[PDB]
Amino acid sequence: MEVKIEKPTPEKLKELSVEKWPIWEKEVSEFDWYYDTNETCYILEGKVEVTTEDGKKYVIEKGDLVTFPKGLRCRWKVLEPVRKHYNLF
């Protein structure tokens, strides 16, 4: 229900124009984030353990597309530096 994570076809990721979306990159640290609007983000390289307040972990690897919804507050444990093409909406 919260935290949509799945492994989409790579074809639709072309059509979405993900190459034209903003890159983001970060260090091997951990911090806590707040999504306040919808954000679709495709993991192109690296490893993270997100965890929600329910203590559910959501690791995402190279191949996981994610959409966080409008209003969610979770941790981000960057277990290797990651690159995710994102777009807010």
What is the CB neighbour count within 10 angstroms for residue 7? 10
Question: Is residue 55 classed as helix, strand or coil in its secondary structure?
Answer: coil
| Total tally of structural domains belonging to the chain | 1
Q: If you search the block for the tokens 């777009």, which residue do you land on?
A: 87
Residue with the two structure tokens 């929600």 = 52
CATH of the domain at 28: 2.60.120.10
Q: Give me the residue label for tokens 């492994």.
A: 7
Q: Which domain holds residue 55?
A: 1-89
Cα–Cα distance, 19 to 28 (Å, whole number):
24
Q: Measured in whole angstroms, how far is the alpha carbon of residue 25 from the centre of its chain? A: 11
